[PDB]
Each structure stands twice: as structure tokens, then as C-alpha cells.
Structure 1
Amino acid sequence: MEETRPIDGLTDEDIREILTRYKKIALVGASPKPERDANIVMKYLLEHGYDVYPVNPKYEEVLGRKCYPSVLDIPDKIEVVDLFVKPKLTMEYVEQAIKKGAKVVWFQYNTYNREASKKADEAGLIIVANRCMMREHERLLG
């Protein structure tokens, strides 16, 4: 009688490790609108010690942080690309994540793209899917 478990196949321990260790985040789809999920999670991660670089070519500053047009333009190392964009947009961002040397691609709810997931797996990145960083942080480090 196997229980349902997340499809990315990571244990609670693996996620807790990624949430404790990898705190340089490129948050793609960042938005200054309070209503968007990306704004709520970006504020929460900044309140919990994450260094969050918003990425969205539309904006130059979001929540007081300079906003970049690509993960590759961020002047720092990036460990996690946290995706708040539609599925077909994620392939490009996974490609940027690979070229930047990120360690983890994190597909937030309704962003998963199989093809993008495949390029990330081929390059060796850890893939987290169908979870929220905020909710996993609350569940595991709360």
C-alpha cells in the first residue's frame, strides 16, 4: 500500500537540505503586483534569509531588488532557479540555469514542462516539481 508522494521523487530530507543550503535564488516571473504568487513567495523568501534576485525583462526593480532580464545577467552565483512562468517559458529559463551553473530548477505549481525538465536532468541539476518554496519551507523548517 504505497502512499502518494511527490512526483519529483525527493524526500523531505532532500528538500530540507536544498532549503537550508541553497539560498541564492533567481525568481523568474517576479512581479511587483501583491496579488501574484511570485510577489508573495519572493517577499516570504526575503524574510527568511534567501538572497532573491528577481528575473523578469518587463521590470527594472521589484520589492526593492534590481530585477534582471535573464538569469545570466545576475552578478552573483545562483543556486536555485525558482520558476513562476508558464510551462513553455520555462525551457528558456532552464537553459539559462544550466549555462549559469545553477544546482536546482524548481517548478512552482502550474509551471512544469517535461522537455525543460529533461534538459535540466541531462545537465545534472536537481529538479523539484509541483511544490512551492514557501509552503515546503513552512512544512519543513517552520
Structure 2
Amino acid sequence: PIDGLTDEDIREILTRYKKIALVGASPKPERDANIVMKYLLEHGYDVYPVNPNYEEVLGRKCYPSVLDIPDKIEVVDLFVDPAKAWRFVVYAIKKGAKVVWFQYNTYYPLAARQAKEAGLIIVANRCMMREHERLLGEKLEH
């Protein structure tokens, strides 16, 4: 992890916030963004795809910006190149999100600091799916 949170904090984020805006969503089954999104949807999360390059992902309308999402968003999960993250962070702030989650290889210091300064929590170099499995684990077969 790049962030300085504890496993307890991560656990809290995953347990308390169910409204997710997944930036960089993709329809390709083999893409990490698609896998994580499906996993979250299968685990009671309300996931809103965000990508200007696509019009819908996993049977959900996909927006160009998180601001275009009608409903409340608590977590903005990033699947974007680091140099592009600032944009989504500014939008996350405007949207009133609570957390900005930088998936692997998406972290960009300046963007993270801006979010932090605005009051948002930063999760970095972690995977929402991997953390869910690690922290809110369940037996693989019952």
C-alpha cells in the first residue's frame, strides 16, 4: 500500500460505503476494471461505471464524468493513468464523495494531496476486490 491507513480503516471503508463510481470501467471481461466491478456488484455494492470512451458497462449506463451520475457517490475507484487522476479527483470533491481509491499503478501524489486537502480519505495501491477478500473474507466453499 502507498496510503498510510490501517487494515481496520480499509475494512471500515468497504463496510460503510456502498455507493461506488468506478472510473475507467470497461466491457472487456479480462480487464481488471471489469473484474473488480463485477465482483463489487456481486457483493452488494451499487456501482456506477464512468468512462467517456464507452456508453455502457456490465449492463449499466456509463458516464463521462462522476458529476453526470445522478445519485450519491461515496467512493471513487480509479482505473486510470496517474497523469489523468487529478481530473477525477476534482470531480470527486465536487460530487461530495468521501473516498478516492487508487487501484494498482494509478496513484498520483499531487492528485491524492488535493483530495486529502478537501477532506477525502485516500486509499492507494490497493484493489477493492483484493481488500474485500482479505479483510472481509469468507470461506471459499461451504
- Give the unaligned 5+ runs of structure 2: 138-142
Distance 1:112 1:13 in 2: 21
Secondary structure at the counterpart of residue 97 of structure 2: coil
Distance 1:7 1:99 in 2: 24
Q: What letter is aligned with 2:53?
A: K
- 1:3 corresponds in structure 2 to none
Distance 1:7 1:91 in 2: 17
Aligned length: 137
> Alignment RMSD, CA only?
0.7
Distance 2:14 2:131 in 1: 8
Q: Identity of paired residues, percent?
A: 88
Q: What letter is aligned with 1:72?
A: L
Q: CA deviation at 1:7?
A: 3.1
Task: Name which of 67, 74, 78 aligns with 1:79.
Answer: 74
- 1:14 corresponds in structure 2 to 9
Distance 1:95 1:120 in 2: 7
Q: CA deviation at 1:8?
A: 1.0
Q: CA deviation at 1:126?
A: 0.2
Q: CA deviation at 1:43?
A: 0.4
Q: Deviations over 1:44-67 (max 9, x none)?
A: 000000000000011111000111
Distance 2:96 2:48 in 1: 15
TM-score, scaled to structure 2: 0.95
Q: Deviations over 1:17-53 (max 9, x none)?
A: 1001111000000000111100000000000000000
Matching of residue 40 in structure 1 with residue 35 in structure 2: yes
Secondary structure at the counterpart of residue 33 of structure 1: coil
Task: Name which of 108, 126, 130 aligns with 2:121.
Answer: 126
Distance 2:114 2:58 in 1: 31
- 2:140 corresponds in structure 1 to none
Q: CA deviation at 1:89?
A: 1.0
TM-score, scaled to structure 1: 0.95
